[model samples]
Every structure is written in structure tokens, then in C-alpha cells.
Target: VKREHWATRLGLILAMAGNAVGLGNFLRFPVQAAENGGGAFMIPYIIAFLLVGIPLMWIEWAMGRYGGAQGHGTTPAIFYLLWRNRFAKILGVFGLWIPLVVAIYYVYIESWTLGFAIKFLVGLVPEPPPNATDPDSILRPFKEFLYSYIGVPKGDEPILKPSLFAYIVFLITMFINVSILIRGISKGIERFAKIAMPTLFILAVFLVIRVFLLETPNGTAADGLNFLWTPDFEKLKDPGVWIAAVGQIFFTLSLGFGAIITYASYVRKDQDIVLSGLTAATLNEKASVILGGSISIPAAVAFFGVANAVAIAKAGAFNLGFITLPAIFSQTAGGTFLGFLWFFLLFFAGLTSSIAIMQPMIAFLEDELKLSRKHAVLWTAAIVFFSAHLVMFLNKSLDEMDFWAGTIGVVFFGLTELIIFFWIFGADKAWEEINRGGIIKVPRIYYYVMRYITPAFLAVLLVVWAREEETHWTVWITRFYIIGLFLFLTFLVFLAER
Candidate 1:
């Protein structure tokens, strides 16, 4: 079978950016900023992006293109090409594992945006409930919505007890996702991305403009914007703040994950990874910095007050995105209109990211196992769908899986790639590969940056995250689960290669 390539350069870049610009770009970025130092986080943030993000991005793009040329898109096959060793493929299992697990749960989470968006469109969501005493009242219906879907127990009757609604939404999202993957790269994924990216930018700008125009229900727009940027020099002393900044970069850029490598594998042999990688990173970062920064903080601080906004920031992304913000949208003017736009952007962002998450593994089965595209997509989607249910009802399981699979798995596998590509593959060779295609020359500084600085930066970030990770027994238990998964994937690879 002939391999698929992205039909257009524009489509490929947009798809790459679409993959990076995800839920984190909107809700998570603002929360990470507020939690670390409010304004001061930007210093370390920019530093980390240059030192860590851009380099890893270039590494992944080069890695993917190298792998794809040889008819492999999954990490194990990709790693084998780079290292040509017995254990290289075994180490590459993280690439497959993280996306499968993350996609299962991610689809579930992304479905909520779809659900809430529908609620706003249908007028099922109303301005904050009447006769409510405190701001907490805003949470009541949203909480019910959450519990209803997850079937979690709350004090009163399950809110919106027709539980099938949530699952239906999940199926809808899964169908859309699988349909695109089935169409192969050019016809399906690229087409969706080109449309989604522009719509997302437009909606984001519209929402931000609406936010700035709102009467500061509590603090002025200046107060909210200033609160976001005014860095405290004192925060610079805290190592945790620095960790948060770098970690945010990794997560926001979709680095340390296999998605970039998978996406880049589709690049034609003569295409430029350097300029393309930089452009995608720039667009993703632009969304993160401007679109992400402007919407949530300005809206939250303006309506909920700085204190409440801070509390929401600390409450976590889901809380801010789903419960708290939805309520504020209800109470604010043009609440339904604004709510519809906000949730739709999230829906599209999540959809694009979720599709990217599933593609690497799908490409693997098709290439390595010689499965038909339909066959590969069908079984994979089935597994993710079934596994997603486990996460939906299983308490704290998703968080544990997310920590090990999404965060830790990305770095561990990523570090392996960096060392192999930069150290084992030789710095000069790696730089040459990155510059192989047409367009602008990569800077000489980045040669040193990729070899020496990038890996060192990743190592420090890894150590901090590992040290700060929880001591709970669940952590170890989940790790054991990860070990079991590795074994399973390794066996599958052995079977495939045989």
C-alpha cells in the first residue's frame, strides 16, 4: 500500500498547530500562570520555551520525518530507525501507550464541552439560578451535569439523570474523530484542521473582545490584565515557580508526547522541518500567550473578583472551564451567546488534539501490522471507547493515568529520543537532517542548544516533576499498571516484527 502524505503545506502546518493548540492553550495556560506568580511567570515561561520547547519540537519533527520515510509512524519503529537496537523498539512503547490512554480519557473530557455547548444553544442553561445566596450557586447545575455524566454520587437526586446523553455525545465525538482518521491525512484530517483553526481564532478574538467590554463585575479590565502580567521579583526565587513555567511549556506545546513525531512523519522528504516546526510552535505559542491569556483571566477576574478568580485558578482546569466559568457566563450579559462561543472553541480544540492523539498508533497498526485503514481505525476506536468508560466512572483513575501516561510518559520517551537523536545519532548528523529540506537555514546556535542545552533543560524539568509527584500508594499502583502496559505493547511489537 502507498503511504499517505499531507496534501498541502498549509494544511500540515495548521494541523500541527491544531494539535498543539488544545484545552491547555485555553484553560490550563491561564491557571498555570496565576498559580505560579501571576505576572512573573512570563519571564521563566519565555526562557523555558526557547530553552526547552522549540528544541524538542525540532527534534520530534526530524525524528518523525526520518521514521515516515521508512514507512513507520509509531515510536517503536521510529526509534528502531534511529538506534537500530534490540531494546530501541521496547523503549519506544511509551509513544503508543500514552496516546491510547490519554485519548480514551481525553475524549470523555472533551465531550463535556460538546454537552455544555449544546446546553447553551438550547437555552437549557440559564442565568445564575434565582434565589441563590452566594457565588457557589453557579456550581449547582454544572456540578449536577458533571455527576450525571460520571454517575458520581452527590447529596441530591442525580442531576439530569438521563445518563445516556453524555455517552451519546462521546459517541458523536468519537464518530467525527474516527471518520476523519479513516479518510487518511490529506482528505480528512487536513480539511478539518484548516476549517477549525480559523474558526477557533475568530471565536477566541470575539470572546476576548466581549470580555474586555464587560463591566468589571468586580475588578477593572486593567486590574485583571495587570494582575496577569505584573511579575513579582520575589517569585523568581521559588524553584517550583520555574518548574511550573517549564512544565506548562511542555504540556502547552504538546511536547514530551508522541503527537509531534507522529504528525511530522507525514512531511514529504524534501520539506523543511526547521521553518515548519518553528512556524507551528510560533502559532501554538501565540494562541497560548494571547488567546489563552486574554479570555479566562480577564473574564474570571472581572466577574468573580480577584480573590475568587485566584481560588478558581487553584481549583484546576476542569473546575474553571466547566463549573465556575459556566456559571459566570450564565450571570453575565449575553451569557448564552458568550457561553456558546466559549464551549464551541473548546470543543474544536479538544477534537483536533484528540484526533492527533489517536493517529500515531493508528498509523503504526496500518504500517507495521499491515491492517487496512478501516480495520486499524475500527479496533483502535473500539478500545479507546471501552477504556473511556472505565475512566468516566472510575474515581481518580483518569488523574493517575494522566500523570503517568501523559506527563511522565512524554518526558521519559522524549528524553530517550533527545539522547538518541542528539547524542547517539551524532549532533552534526541530526542538525543536517533538520536542515535537509528547502527553506531557511536553521541557526547555528540551535545546534548547540539541541545537543547540550535541550537535554539538560529536559532533565532538570524531569527531576523536579518526579520529586514533586505524589507519595500516595496510588502513584505506585498506577506505575505498576504502566509497567504491565509496557509489557503488553512490547509483546505486540514482537508479534508484528515476526
Candidate 2:
């Protein structure tokens, strides 16, 4: 079978950047920045970006194109070829495992965007009840909307009921996935990403302009600006600050998630990946730090006041996006349109990233198991359908699973790959591969950074996160969940060996 690839340079870059820019860009990045000391965070952020972000970006693209050249799409096959050993193949399963696991819950969350967009269009969104008070007035109606969308019953048991709405919207989301992906690489993923990326970027810029203009008696737009921009250099001493920067980079770039690898796999042999990798990283950071940072935090501060904004930032990303933003929109001018645009942009972002996740698993089946595209996509759908229910219904399970799989799993796989590429594959050889078909010369300085600096920084990241209180999972059910993940991956290795 002939391999399908990116049809145009524009399409490939947009798709690559789109995969990196997701819900995390706007929702999580700003929250982390705000909660971690605002502008002070940028110090370590820039450092980590240079060390971990840029280097890993190049490494994934290098590994990917190499794997694709030999017709291997996912990590297991890719890693096996690199090391020619069982250990490398076993470690590579993490690459395949993280994306497949993250997608199950990720799509369920993505459905919220579609749900909210529909609600906004039809005007199903209710304002605060008459004579409503401050936080409750804002939190109550949106909380009900969230619960209703997820099918949480009133009071006591937190488990979600079977949600026909969730199911219907999920199918719509999956249909979009199937439609584009079924057309093959150039016609499908590349094309959809080109449209989605531009739409997301424009909407984000529109909202950023709207958000910066906002002012209230409690705070001016400048107050929000100062809150995000004025640095407190003293905060840089905190090790936690550095870890937050690294985490944000990892989450926003979608590193170690197999999306980058799978997307880069389609790059034609003659194309220059150095430019492609750098361009994608640049667009991702711009969307994440420049645009995303400006909108959410500033708008919250301008409308809700500093104390309320602090509380909102502390409440987590989902709270800020789903709860606080909607409340702010209700009280602002052109409230309906702003709310509609906000959720829709998020919908597009999530849609692009989630589709990238689907591609690796489908590619895995198609390349490794010799399944047709239809069979591959169907199997992917079946896996998502089963796992989404658990994620939706089980109380606190989503957060737990996210912590283990999305957070911990990513850094671990990334660290492992750095070792495989620069150490095992040899730094000299890896550098040569990254520079192949290159347009602009990659600075020889990055040779040292990629070989030494990036891996050392990643080691610190792993240790820092390992020591954090947030990383520990002690609950009995979560203990089993951890075990189940290992067992499943072990099963895959057995099949791979067969």
C-alpha cells in the first residue's frame, strides 16, 4: 500500500501547530501562570521552552520521520527499530498508551464545547436568577448546565446517569473525526486542521481584543495587564515555579503524546522538518502564551475583581472556562456573542488535538495489524466509546486518571525517548537526521542542548514532579486503575512480540 502524506507545506504546518494548541493552551496555561506568580513564571518558562520544549519538538519530528520512512507509525515499532531490543519496544508502548488513554476522556470533555455552543446559539443559557448574589449567582446556573450536560443526578451520589445528550454529541464529535480521517492524510487531517487552526486563531485574537478593553469599578484593564506582566523576581527561587513552567510546556506542546510523532510520520522525505518543527512550536507558544494568557486571566480580573479572580484561578481550568467565563459574558456587552465565540474556539481547538490522538491508534492498527482504515477507525471508536462512559460516570476518576496518564505518563515517555534518541541512537547521528532536508541551518549550539541540556532538564522535571504532593495517587480504586494500565500495556507488548 502506498503511504499518504501531507499535501502542502501550509496544511502540514497548520495541522502540526493545531495539534499542539488545544484546551490546555487557553484554559490551563493562563491558570498556571496566574496561580504560580504571574510574570515571574515566565523566567523558568522561557528557560524550559529553550531546553525542554524546542529540543523535544525537534526530537519527536526526527524520530517520526525516521519511523515513517520505514512504514512504522506508532512508538512500539519505531522504538524497536531504534534499539533492536525488547526493552526499547516495551518503553515505546508508553507512547502508544498515553494518546489512546487521554483520548477516551478528552473526547468526553470536548463534547462540552459542542454542548455549550448549541446552548449559546439556541439561547438555552439562563442568566442568574432574579436578585441573585455574587459567586453563587454566577456559579449556580452554570453548575446546573454542566451537571445536566454530563447527566449528574441531584444530590448525594456523584455518578453520572446515562446521558442521551452526551451520547448524541459524542457521536457528532466522532463523526467529524471519522469523516476527515477516513479520507486519508492529505485530504483529511491536513485540510481540517488548516480550517480549524485559522478559525481558532482569529476567534482567540477577537476575544483577546474584547478582553483587554474590559474595565470595571474594581479594576481597570491595566490592572489585569499588570497582574499578568509585572514580574516578582524573588519568586524564581521556588522550585515549584520551575516545575509549573515545564508542565505547561509539556501540556501545551502535546509532547510525548504520540500526536507529534504520528503527524510528523506523514512528512515527505524531501521536506525540511527543522522549519516545520520550529514553525509549529512558534505558533503554539504564540497562541498559548501571547493570546491565551491575555484573554482568560485579564477578563476574570477586570470583571470579577482581584480577590474573586484569585479564587477563580485557584479553582482550576475547567472552573475558569466553564463557570467564570460564562458568568463574565452574561454581565458584559454582547454577552451572547462573546460566550458563543469563546466556547466555539475551544471546540475547534479540542477537535483538532483529539483527531491527532485518533490518528496514532488508527495508524497503529493499519500498519502493525494490517487492518484497513475503516477497521482501524472503527476499533478506535469502540475503545473511546467504552472508556468515555467510565470517565463520565465515575466521580473523581477523571482527575485521577488525568494526573497519572496525562501528566506523569507524558514526562516519563518523553524522558525515555530523549535517552533513546540522543544516547542510544548516538547524538551525532540524531543531529544529522534532524538537519536533513533543512532550509535554515539549525545552530550547532542546539547540538549540545539536545544531547545534554534537554535530558538534564527533563531529569529535574521528573524528580520535581515525583516529589510533589499532587503526583501521589493513594486511593484504592485509583490504585487498581494504575494496575489496570500496566496490565493493558503489558498485553500489548505480548501481542507485539507475537
Candidate 3:
């Protein structure tokens, strides 16, 4: 393993932030907010962020930096550095597969963004559908692309199959992820974050001001605002809301992906991490769930102008950035250029995130195989680039893959990470990692919280979800899908090493 890290603190933050702000912020949260509980969801979401998200974030940072400084990637390197438990190594390595699978679908979601970018650049939105909404007019290229390129069923199914447009989007996403990774730690990952993250925040704030404050009463903005800030806890009584809220907090942070550990590997040896890590994690959550919430969720409700806009806003709530947010871009600002700006800003945001996903795998190759940065980048990126197309086209394969990778797999793997960090290694070791390179000492009280409260809360929700037995049993089946990832990665790692 190597201790190669970013050049500065902001670089690290930006890298982490880039990873945090992926397609989920744009697409997923809005949909989840409405579906689960609307304003009511925040109560648990905010609570989970504090109790679960923040703590787990710090935990990941601790393990990652500790391992990075010590030389590691994913669970094998991380747990090995701490306790050298053979079992921990197996469990920790088990953690990496989740991200690998997620990257597969994530690459596909990025493809959607690429396709939409093409569509918006040309002109499409604010138009009705072909069969019903616009029977007289032929379907737009995008709608056709939907079915012709992707496998989505139309008419009864409400979408078209794959088209030339669909897979092109995916290739662009894969290219961005792999290209940046090929640059290696400083040049590829750090350089982009330093430039992109701040720019993204600025653009986002610009959007918030434009849509939230400046726009004339589209009628829906006011109510969208209300649904967001105004509290409605009626839905909290149901166990499902709690389950979803907690699950969302976990998923949104990208906790189980093992990317956090990869980023943490670059932490400054003597930096005040407790404060820095918490700030990063807290800030990341707010950007993803809350600050981001202000923009996409509210704007979608307003822009669509339907009472059901709130519901639609939450259509893909878990993916606030890509799926939901882009829909907002197409609707707002009264100009095609504005729409382009919104998507480009988002494209860069996703580009930043997509790069970090490859870093972990790249690192494994560089370290285990002793590959040069160039070769590591080439091999890993090449694999991811080609592998992603398996999901790029918006068909049944891609959609089912996305559903499995995005939500279900995230939760399943995230829970697995928790089990490894807390139950396997025990909170004692994880706490030490959390407090390591300490700028601020975590309070003694965190011990009880980690040992009992955190697990108790998580376990309750985990069981509650299990009890519900969702109609889409496909989500549960996706949990096993990670094993497929493990096998592929094992082959790569072994082959690369040999």
C-alpha cells in the first residue's frame, strides 16, 4: 500500500464532497421524500444523519486515513492495518464488492445524464408525450431514444426501448470516471475536485436563488417550499417511513460504497480529523439531503405545478441529482441556455463523483499488482468503461440493475459495513480509528452511542424493513448481487497480482 494522498485539506474535502454529491442528490432524495413521508421524512432523516450518518462518516474517515497512511484499499487493507484479523480481512474485502456493483449501475445513471444533456442541448422538454400528451405530434427524439435504445416498455409500460442515444450517455460517464482515475491520486482525483466542487456549490446557490427567490409565483414553488420546510410528522407512525428515512440517510452518504475509505487514505497524518471529518460529513449530508433538498425538491414541485408535483418530485427521490434535478433544469430559467448550464454543472458534479469510484480499484491494482499509475489507470478504467455499457442502455437490464445497485444494494452493503466496523471489529477499534489523527477529541459519550444506541436504532429499522416484505422482492434479491461483483473483482485482483 502507498500513502499517496491529495495535496491539501480542501482537496480532500472536495474529493469527498465530489463523491457525496453524485446522481443520488439530484434524483433519489426528492422521490423518496414524497413517497415515504413528504415533510414528515425530514424528522427521521435529520435524526439519522446525526446519530448514524455523521458517526459512520467519521468512522469511515478514521479507518480510511489510518489504512491509507498505513497502506491499504477497501476492507482488506483497512481491517488488516488495525487488528490483522484474517476474518476481518475477508469481511472488509466483502465490503468492496458493493461499490463495484454500485459503480456498474452508477455508470448507467451517468449515461442517462449524458443522454439528457444531448436531448436538452437539442430541445425536448415542456412537451407532452406522443400517444396521449402529443398524439398529433411525433414523439421527441428522447422519448424514442428511451424505448429504442433502452429496454423500457412503452404504451402500457409508459416508455420506449433503447436507442442510439442511450448507450452514448453511458460511454461518456465511463470515460470521465476512468480518465480522471488514470491521472492517479493528485493529478486525476485531487485536481478535478479542487476545481469542480467549489464551482458546483456556486452554481447550486445560483440555482437556489433563481428558483427559490427570484422566480415569479409559478404557484407550485410556494407549496413546494412549504412541503420542504414545514414539518409534517403524521407519516412517522408507520414503521416503513422510519425504515426508509434511516436507509436514505445511510445511502445518501455513500457510506457502504467503500469509497470513503479510499478518500480517507489520503487524510493528513496530524490533521484535526474529528472536527474536520464531522464537518465534511455534516456538510456533505446537508448538501445532499437538505441544501440540495431546497433546490430540486422545491423546484420540481413548483416547476411541474401539479398538486401531485410533490409526489413527482419524489418520483426518483433517492436520485435527486441525476433523475429528479435534471427534470427541474429542463423546466426552469425560461431559456435553453439555462437548461444547458444546469446540466453541465451537474455533469461536472457527477464527473467528480464518478472518478472517485474508480480510485479504490485503481489503488488495489497499483498496490497489489505493483502496477504503475499509468497501467493501473488504464487497466481499471478500461474494465470499468467497458463493463459499464452492460448497464448504459435504458432497458430492463439497466433499470433492474439500477434499482438493485442504487437503493437495495446500497442498504444491504451499507449494513454489511456496519456489521464489520462495529460488530466484527467492535466499536472500540472503530472509535480509536475515528479519534485517530485527532484535531478534536470525540466526547466520551460517543462510546455508548456507538455500542448500543447506533446498533439498536439500525437493527430495529433493518428488521422493520425485513418484516415489511416489499412487493418488489427484486430489491432484496439485489443483496445477493454483490456476490457477483465479489467474484469478478477477485479475479481481477488475483490476475492483476499474478
Q: Give the Å error, residue 413, model 3.
A: 4.0
On TM-score, the candidate that comes out on top is: 2
Supply candidate 3's per-residue lDDT for 169: 63
Ranking by TM-score: 2, 1, 3
Off by over 4 Å in 2: 129-135, 152-158, 468-486, 496-498
Compared to the true structure, candidate 3 yields what TM-score? 0.85
Clashing pairs in 2: none
Kindly give the stretch of ten consecutive residues in candidate 3 with the minimal lDDT sum.
130-139
Candidate 2, residues 78-161, lDDT tens digits: the string is 888887888877787777778877887788788888888888988888677433346576668887777777877577565666
lDDT of 3: 0.65
What is the alpha-carbon lDDT for the whole of candidate 2?
0.82
TM values, all candidates = 0.94, 0.95, 0.85
Q: Name the candidate, 1 or 3, with the larger lDDT value.
A: 1
Q: For residue 122, give model 1's deviation from the true position in Å.
A: 0.8
**Model 3 ranges with Cα > 4 A deviation:** 83-85, 122-151, 155-161, 213-218, 303-306, 317-333, 402-405, 422-426, 469-482, 491-498
In candidate 1, list every pair of residues with a backbone clash.
40-231, 256-410
